Amino acid sequence: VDLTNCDREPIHIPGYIQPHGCLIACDNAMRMVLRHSENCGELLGLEGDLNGRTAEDVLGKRLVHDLRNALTVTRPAMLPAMETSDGRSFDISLHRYKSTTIIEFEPSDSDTQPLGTARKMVDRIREADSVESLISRTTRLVKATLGYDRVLIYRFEEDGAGKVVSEAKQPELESFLGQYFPASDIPQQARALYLKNTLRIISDASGTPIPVLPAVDVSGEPLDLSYAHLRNFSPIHCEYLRNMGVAASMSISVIVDDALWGLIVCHHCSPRVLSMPVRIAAAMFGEFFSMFLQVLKQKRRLDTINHAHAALDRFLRLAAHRANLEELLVDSFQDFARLIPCDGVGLWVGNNWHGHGATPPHDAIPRLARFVASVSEGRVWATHALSQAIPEAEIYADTAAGMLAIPISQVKSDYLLFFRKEIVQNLNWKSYETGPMGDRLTPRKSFAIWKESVRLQAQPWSEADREIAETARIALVGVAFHHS
Amino acid sequence: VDLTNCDREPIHIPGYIQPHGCLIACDNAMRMVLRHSENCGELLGLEGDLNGRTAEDVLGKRLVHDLRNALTVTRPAMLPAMETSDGRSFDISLHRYKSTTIIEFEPSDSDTQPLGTARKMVDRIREADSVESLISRTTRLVKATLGYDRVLIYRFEEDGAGKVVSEAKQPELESFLGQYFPASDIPQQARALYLKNTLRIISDASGTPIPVLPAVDVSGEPLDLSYAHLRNFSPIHCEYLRNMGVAASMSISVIVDDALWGLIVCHHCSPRVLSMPVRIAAAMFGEFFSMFLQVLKQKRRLDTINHAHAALDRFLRLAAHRANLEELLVDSFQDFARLIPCDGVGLWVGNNWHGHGATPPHDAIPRLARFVASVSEGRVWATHALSQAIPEAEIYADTAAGMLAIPISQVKSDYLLFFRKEIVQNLNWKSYETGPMGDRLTPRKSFAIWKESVRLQAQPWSEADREIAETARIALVGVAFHHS
Ligand SMILES: *C/C=C1/C(=C/C2=NC(=C\c3[nH]c(/C=C4\NC(=O)C(C=C)=C4C)c(C)c3CCC(=O)O)/C(CCC(=O)O)=C2C)NC(=O)C1C
Ligand SMILES: *C/C=C1/C(=C/C2=NC(=C\c3[nH]c(/C=C4\NC(=O)C(C=C)=C4C)c(C)c3CCC(=O)O)/C(CCC(=O)O)=C2C)NC(=O)C1C
Ligand SMILES: [Cl-]
Ligand SMILES: [Cl-]
Numbered sequence: 001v002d003l004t005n006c007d008r009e010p011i012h013i014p015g016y017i018q019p020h021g022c023l024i025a026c027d028n029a030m031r032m033v034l035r036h037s038e039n040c041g042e043l044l045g046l047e048g049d050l051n052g053r054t055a056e057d058v059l060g061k062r063l064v065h066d067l068r069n070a071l072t073v074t075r076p077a078m079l080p081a082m083e084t085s086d087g088r089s090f091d092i093s094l095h096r097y098k099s100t101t102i103i104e105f106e107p108s109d110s111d112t113q114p115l116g117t118a119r120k121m122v123d124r125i126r127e128a129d130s131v132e133s134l135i136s137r138t139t140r141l142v143k144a145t146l147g148y149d150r151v152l153i154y155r156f157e158e159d160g161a162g163k164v165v166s167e168a169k170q171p172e173l174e175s176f177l178g179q180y181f182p183a184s185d186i187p188q189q190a191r192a193l194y195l196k197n198t199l200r201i202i203s204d205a206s207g208t209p210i211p212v213l214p215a216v217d218v219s220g221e222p223l224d225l226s227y228a229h230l231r232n233f234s235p236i237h238c239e240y241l242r243n244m245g246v247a248a249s250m251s252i253s254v255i256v257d258d259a260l261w262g263l264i265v266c267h268h269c270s271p272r273v274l275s276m277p278v279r280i281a282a283a284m285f286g287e288f289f290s291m292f293l294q295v296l297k298q299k300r301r302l303d304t305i306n307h308a309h310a311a312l313d314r315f316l317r318l319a320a321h322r323a324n325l326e327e328l329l330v331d332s333f334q335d336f337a338r339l340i341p342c343d344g345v346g347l348w349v350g351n352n353w354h355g356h357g358a359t360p361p362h363d364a365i366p367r368l369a370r371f372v373a374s375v376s377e378g379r380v381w382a383t384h385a386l387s388q389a390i391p392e393a394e395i396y397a398d399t400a401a402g403m404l405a406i407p408i409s410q411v412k413s414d415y416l417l418f419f420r421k422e423i424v425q426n427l428n429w430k431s432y433e434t435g436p437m438g439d440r441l442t443p444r445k446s447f448a449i450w451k452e453s454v455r456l457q458a459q460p461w462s463e464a465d466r467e468i469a470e471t472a473r474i475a476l477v478g479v480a481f482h483h484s
Numbered sequence: 485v486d487l488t489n490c491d492r493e494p495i496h497i498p499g500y501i502q503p504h505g506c507l508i509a510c511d512n513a514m515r516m517v518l519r520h521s522e523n524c525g526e527l528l529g530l531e532g533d534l535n536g537r538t539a540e541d542v543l544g545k546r547l548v549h550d551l552r553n554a555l556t557v558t559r560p561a562m563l564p565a566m567e568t569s570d571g572r573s574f575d576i577s578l579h580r581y582k583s584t585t586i587i588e589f590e591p592s593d594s595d596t597q598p599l600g601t602a603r604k605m606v607d608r609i610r611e612a613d614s615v616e617s618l619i620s621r622t623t624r625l626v627k628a629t630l631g632y633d634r635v636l637i638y639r640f641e642e643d644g645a646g647k648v649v650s651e652a653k654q655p656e657l658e659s660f661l662g663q664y665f666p667a668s669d670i671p672q673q674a675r676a677l678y679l680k681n682t683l684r685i686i687s688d689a690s691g692t693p694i695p696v697l698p699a700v701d702v703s704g705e706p707l708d709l710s711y712a713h714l715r716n717f718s719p720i721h722c723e724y725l726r727n728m729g730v731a732a733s734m735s736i737s738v739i740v741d742d743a744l745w746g747l748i749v750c751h752h753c754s755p756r757v758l759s760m761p762v763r764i765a766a767a768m769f770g771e772f773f774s775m776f777l778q779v780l781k782q783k784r785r786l787d788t789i790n791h792a793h794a795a796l797d798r799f800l801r802l803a804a805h806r807a808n809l810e811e812l813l814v815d816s817f818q819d820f821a822r823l824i825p826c827d828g829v830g831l832w833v834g835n836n837w838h839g840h841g842a843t844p845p846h847d848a849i850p851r852l853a854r855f856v857a858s859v860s861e862g863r864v865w866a867t868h869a870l871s872q873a874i875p876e877a878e879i880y881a882d883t884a885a886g887m888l889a890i891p892i893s894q895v896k897s898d899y900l901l902f903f904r905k906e907i908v909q910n911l912n913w914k915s916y917e918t919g920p921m922g923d924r925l926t927p928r929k930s931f932a933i934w935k936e937s938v939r940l941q942a943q944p945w946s947e948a949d950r951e952i953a954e955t956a957r958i959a960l961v962g963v964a965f966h967h968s
Contacts, residue, residue: 117968122965284661287894288965291958298955299793305786410771471782474775481772484599 001236003440007188009234013222016232017058017213020203020273021106021179023212023230025223028066028099032056035223037230039210043105045086051213058086067094071101073197076227080276081108091276095227102223104230109275119283121145125289131296135166138264138289143168146274146282148250148266152176155262158460159183161450162262166320173269176443180450181439193226196261199283204271205241205248229279238467240441241267243432249274252286256294264289301464308339308468312475325483329408330354336416339472340465343426344400346417349408359419360393360400367392372405373413380469384420384460394456402458406469408476416476418469420458424451485722487924493674493718494681497706500716501697504687504757505590507696507714509707512583514539514552519707521714523694527589529570535697536680544569551578555585558642558680560711564760565592575760579711588714593759602768605629609773609960619650621774622748627652630758630766632734636660639746639775642944643667645934646746657753658914660927664934666750677710679744683767688715688755689725689732713763722957724925725751725852727916732756736770740778748773786947792952796959809967813892814838820900823956824949827910828884830901833892844884851876856889857897865951868904868944878940881906886942890953892960900960902953904942908935 001009017023022043036050046058055064063084070077076095084090093104124141127132135153143151150173151167154276160183167177194200209232212223221329225231241249248268264286274282315332322328326349333347334356344357346365353365360368371390375381382404387394401422408414432442439445461469485493501507506527520534521643539548547568554561560579568574577588588734591765608625627635634657635649644667651661660846678684693716696707709715725733732752738745748770758766761900799816806812810833817831818840828841828850837849844852855874859865866888871878892898916926923929945953 036720119968125964126962148830220875284894288962291962295955295958298951302786302789302793305782306790309783309786409913467782471779474779477607477773478610478775481603482610484603 001234003236006184006309008023009187009189009204009236009383011187011189011228011234012193012224012231014225014232015212015232016209017212017225017228018201018203018232019207020065020212021104021230022210023225024050024058024103024105024227025100025212026103027129028096028101029370030064030101032070033058034100034217035214037210037212038357043107044084045088051211058472067103070094071096074227076229078276078280081110082169093229093276097227098224098306099206100223102225102228104228106273109277112277114276114280114284116144117278117281121281121285123446124287125292128292128296129340131293131300132240134289134296139166139168142264142266142282146266146278148272149269150267152265152267153254153262154181154265156260160186161453165262166237166406176288179443180454181443181446182450184449185446191260193264194251194253197229198255198286199229200233200249200251200277201229201279202249202275204242205238205246207271221403234428236437236441239435241436243441244443245269245435248401250274250282251336252282252289254286254293255290255359256297261290261293270300279417294418304464305468305471308471311335311339312472316475316479317452319415319482321342325480326350333416336444336472337418339468340404340418340461341420341459342404343421346419348415350412350414357419359417360396360420364393364396367405368417369413369415372403372415372417376405376415378410379474380466380473382409382461382466383468385457387456398425400458401456402461403460404465404469404475406476408473409480416472422456423454423459426459485718488920490668493671493673493720494675495671495718496677496708496710496715497715498718499696499706499710499711500693500961501696501712502687502716503691503694505588505714506694506707507712508534508542508587508589510539510585510587512580512585512880514548514555514585515727517542518584518701519696519698521694521696528568529572533697535709551576551587554578555580558711560713562760562764565594577713577760580621580712582708584707586712588712590757590760596759596761596765596838598761598764598768601629601762601765605765605769606772607755609776612780615777615784618773618777622904623650623652626748626750626766626769630734630762632752633657633755633802635752636749636751637738637746638665640747641746644670644939645743646670649746653751662912662929663931664938665927665930666934666937669930669935675744678735678737678747681711681713683713683741683763684717684733684735684756685713685763686722686725686733687757689722689730691755700760720921720925723919723921727925728927729753734758734766736766736773738770738777739774740781744779745774768870789946789952789955795819795823796956800959800963803963803966809964810834817900820956821902823946823952824888824902825904825943826888827903827905828903830903832899832901834896834898841903842883842905843901844880848877848880852887852901853897853899856887856899856901860889860891860899862894864891864950864957866892866945866950866953869941871940872932875930878898881940884942885940886945888945888949889952890957890960892957893964894961900956905936906940907943910943 017037023037024033026033033050040050041047050058070079074097076093079092081089082092084251089108090105095102101217121141125134125138139151139153144222150169152164155165155349156162162181164176164179167175216222246267247270251267252264316441319328329347329349334345337345344359346359347354348369367450383389384402386401387397400419402420404418406416432444501521506524507521508517510517516538517534524534525531533540536681541822554563558581560577563576565573566576573592574589574873575592579586609618609622623635623637634650634653638646639649640646646665648660648663651659700706730751730752734750736748803812813833818829821829828843830843831838832853867873868886870885870887873882884903888902890900892900916928
C-alpha cells in the first residue's frame with residue numbers, strides 16, 4: 001500500500017481485526033463456523049481450530065437459540081452481557097452481509113444505561129437555535145461526556161476537502177480549528193463505508209492486529225467486514241494517527257439529506273475502548289445531531305431567501321418612485337452586497353464602471369464585461385476560478401478570484417458583478433515526527449497540499465447564492481422593461 | 485403515421501412548410517442555395533429551379549450583405565420589412581442549425597410596434613401576487629390583445645399528463661377547464677422541440693402543405709426545421725384540431741427552472757396568421773410570464789414551509805407543558821392536516837387507531853400499520869397508488885387511494901398517517917365529428933383514456949409535501965425521545 005492513487009485500497013476486506021475483541025463468521029443460516037479470528041481461543045477459552053465445527057458445538061445450543069432468534073428481526077443487532085456455555089460474560093455485535101453471519105465478542109460492561117446517557121446529551125442540543133450554536137456546544141458536550149482528549153467536527157466542502165469547524169481539546173494539545181485538509185486524506189471507499197457504518201473506533205493505533213482464518217476461502221473470496229466494528233483500519237491512517245501522537249479514535253457519521261455532511265471525530269493520546277452500551281448512546285446522539293442540523297440548515301436557507309425577497313421588494317418600491325432607473329442603480333448597487341456574501345460588488349451600466357469593496361482594477365473591467373457578455377446568454381454566470389476563464393485575471397486574484405454576474409437588462413449588455421477574494425486570503429488559522437512512509441502523513445503537509453489545490457480560487461457560489469442571483473435577475477430585468 | 489407508439493414520429497423533418505410563407509436553405513456560409521420551397525417562385529416572383537444557383541444571384545448582392553451581416557451576432561435573428569432586388573417587402577426569419585442556413589420569407593407588416601404591445605401586457609401581469617392571480621388574468625389578457633377565440637393554459641403533471649388550469653373563450657364554444665389529457669397527446673419529441681422553440685403557429689390546419697425541394701439531398705439527409713417557424717405540423721395533431729373545429733393555433737412555451745412547465749395555447753375557428761412584429765411581442769410576453777410564475781412558485785414554496793415550521797413550533801411549546809405526550813397526540817392529530825394537503829389523517833399509537841376525515845375502514849388499519857412498519861425503515865414512506873402495494877386496499881380506494889406515513893417514535897412502531905381520495909373523486913369538470921384515423925383524436929376520448937390511466941390513484945405527494953413530512957418526523961421523534 002503506497003500513497004499515490006488513494007481511492008484504490010480495499011479497506012473493507014483487510015482480513016484482520018483489532019485486539020479488543022474476537023470475531024466468528026458462520027454460513028447464511030448460522031449452521032457451522034467458516035472463519036474465525038486467531039484470538040478466538042484466548043478470549044472464549046476454546047482450544048484448537050474452530051473452522052468446520054458446527055455453531056451448536058462451539059458456543060452451545062443455549063446461546064445459538066438466542067443469536068438465531070435475533071437475526072430474525074443489514075443494521076447490526078447488539079446483544080449485551082450474554083452468557084456463554086463456559087459461564088463467561090460477553091457483549092455480542094451480530095450482523096449478516098453477503099449471506100455471511102458475523103458474530104463479534106467483547107468483554108462485558110453491565111454498569112451503564114444507554115438511553116439515560118443519550119437523553120441527557122440530546123436534551124442539551126435539542127434547543128440550539130442556529131448551526132453555529134449546535135456545532136460549538138456539541139464538541140464541548142461530547143468531550144465532557146466521553147472524556148476524549150480532543151473532539152473535532154470535520155465538515156466536507158463541495159470539492160471533497162474537509163474543514164475543522166469546531167474543536168474541544170486539552171490545553172496542552174495544538175489546535176486544528178479553521179484548518180482545511182485535501183479530499184484525498186479521506187478516500188472515496190472510506191466515505192462509502194462511513195455512509196453505511198455510522199460509528200467507528202480504533203482502540204490502539206499501535207496495537208498488534210489479529211488475523212482472520214482463513215483470510216481467503218475455497219472460492220477465492222475475502223471476508224467483507226463493512227458492518228463489523230472490529231474491522232482493522234488502513235495502516236496509512238494508523239501511521240497518520242501515530243505521527244499526530246493519537247493512540248485511539250472514535251468517529252460519528254453526520255448524515256444530512258441522505259449525504260455525508262461530515263464527521264464528529266474524537267482523538268485520545270492513550271489507548272481507549274468504548275463499551276457497547278456507551279457506543280449505543282453515542283450512536284443515538286449522532287442520529288439526533290444529524291436530524292437537528294438538517295432542520296437548522298433548512299431554517300437558515302429559508303431565512304436567507306426570505307431576507308433577499310424583502311430586500312428586492314424594498315428596491316422595487318423605490319424604482320416605481322424614481323424616473324431615472326440608471327441613477328437609482330448607481331446610488332444603490334453596493335446595497336445588493338447584503339443579498340449574496342461577497343468581498344466586493346460592481347455595476348457595469350452604459351459602458352461605465354462603478355466599484356465597491358474588493359473588485360478587479362478599473363482598466364481590467366471592460367475585458368471582463370466583454371467576456372461575460374459572450375458566455376452569459378442572458379442567464380446568471382458564476383465561476384470560483386476566474387483565471388481558468390481569463391488567464392490575465394491571475395494578476396488580481398488576491399483581490400477578486402471569483403465572480404458571479406447578473407444581467408440587469410433584457411436588451412442592453414448591463415451587469416451587476418459580485419466578486420470574492422481567493423480563499424487563502426480569508427484564512428483564520430508545530431513539528432511532527434514521521435514514520436516509514438514519509439512526512440505526507442502529517443497535518444502540516446496535508447494543509448500545505450490543500451493551500452496549493454485552492455491557489456487563485458475563491459469560496460464557491462452555493463445553490464442559495466445562485467437561487468438569489470436568479471430571483472434578483474428576474475426583479476431587475478422586470479423593472480428595467482417597465483422603464484425602457 | 486398510425487396512433488400506437490406516439491413518441492416515434494420525426495416531426496422536426498417533415499420536408500413540408502405551411503403556405504403563409506416560403507423557405508430557402510443555403511450552405512453554412514450562405515454561398516449558394518441547396519434547398520427551396522415549391523412556392524418560392526410564386527411569392528418572390530422568381531421562375532424555374534433555384535437549387536445550385538448562388539445566393540448573390542437569387543436575392544441580389546444588396547440583400548445578402550445584410551443577411552450575412554446578421555448571421556454574425558442558434559436563436560433565430562428576425563429582420564422585418566426587408567427590400568428584395570425586385571422591390572417587394574418581406575419579413576425575414578434567419579437561423580443556422582446543423583451547419584445549414586435557413587431563410588424564411590413572409591409578406592410584410594410595418595404598422596405595429598413590438599416593444600409597445602409587449603410592455604402594455606407585461607405591465608398588467610408584473611403586479612400579480614399569486615400563481616392563481618397570474619394564471620387567471622393571463623388567459624383573459626392574451627384573448628383581449630391577440631383576439632383568439634379560445635386561450636388555454638395547459639399545465640403538465642408529474643406523469644406527463646396535462647391539466648387545463650385557466651380558460652378565456654367565446655361564450656358559444658365548449659369549456660375544457662379542469663379537464664386532463666394523457667402524456668401521449670403531446671409526445672416526447674414534441675416537448676423537446678417546445679423547450680428550444682418557445683413560440684409555434686398553425687395558420688390553417690386545413691391548408692395545403694408546400695413541399696421542400698429536395699426533401700432528401702445527395703447524402704440521404706433531410707432538412708431539420710426545428711427552429712423554422714414555417715415547419716408543417718404532424719397530420720395527427722392537424723386532424724385533432726379539425727375534429728375540434730379549430731382552424732388555427734398559436735402556443736407559447738412556459739419555461740420554469742429550465743423545465744417545460746406547460747403551454748399558453750390559443751385556438752381560432754377561422755384561419756389566422758400573426759405578423760412577425762406581433763409574434764416578437766407575444767414571445768417577449770411569454771418570457772416574462774415564465775419568469776414571474778417561477779418567482780411566484782418560489783415564494784409559495786417558502787410560505788408553505790414557513791407555515792409548517794410555525795405550526796410545529798406551536799406544537800413543541802404545548803408538548804413541553806403536558807406530561808402525557810400520547811394524550812396530546814390523540815387530542816391534536818387532526819390539526820396536522822393543515823401542514824400537508826390531505827382528504828383524511830390518522831394516528832396509530834400503542835396499537836390503537838384514531839381517524840379524521842376520509843380514511844380506510846377501522847378493520848383495514850392494522851394490516852396497513854403492519855405493512856408500513858415493514859417497508860418504512862424509520863423513514864417517511866409515501867405512495868399515490870395504495871392498491872399496487874396492498875391489493876385488498878382496492879375496495880376502499882374511493883376513500884383512500886394514497887398514503888403518506890410519518891414515524892413519530894425512534895423505538896415503538898407508532899405512525900401519523902395522511903390519506904388522499906382517488907384523483908377522479910376530486911374532479912371539478914358535447915359531440916365531435918371524426919376524421920380518417922378514428923375517434924381517438926377528440927377531447928372526449930383523450931379525457932376518457934386519462935380517467936382510466938389514474939384509476940385507484942390519488943394526487944401524488946409533491947417534494948414540498950415530503951420535505952414537510954420529514955421536518956415533522958424530526959420534530960415528533962425528537963420530542964418523543966425527551967418524554968420516553
Ligand atoms: C493515500 C491515502 C491517504 C489516506 C487514506 C485514508 N484516510 C482514512 C481515514 C481518515 N483520514 C482522516 C483524516 C484526518 N483526521 C484528523 O483528525 C486529521 C487531522 C489533521 C486528519 C487529516 C480521518 C478523520 C479519517 C477517518 C477516521 C475515522 O473514521 O476514525 C482512511 C480510511 C480508514 C479506514 O480503514 O476506515 C484511508 C484509507 N489519508 C491520507 O492522508 C492519505 C494520503
Ligand atoms: C399518437 C400521437 C398523438 C398526438 C401527437 C402529437 N400531438 C402534438 C401536439 C399537441 N397536442 C396537443 C393537445 C391538445 N391541444 C388542445 O387544445 C387539446 C384540447 C383538448 C389537446 C388534447 C397540443 C396542445 C399540442 C401542441 C400544439 C402546438 O404546439 O401548437 C404533436 C406535435 C405537433 C407538431 O408537429 O409540433 C404530436 C406529434 N396527439 C394525440 O392526441 C395523439 C394520439
Ligand atoms: Cl448594510
Ligand atoms: Cl383549521
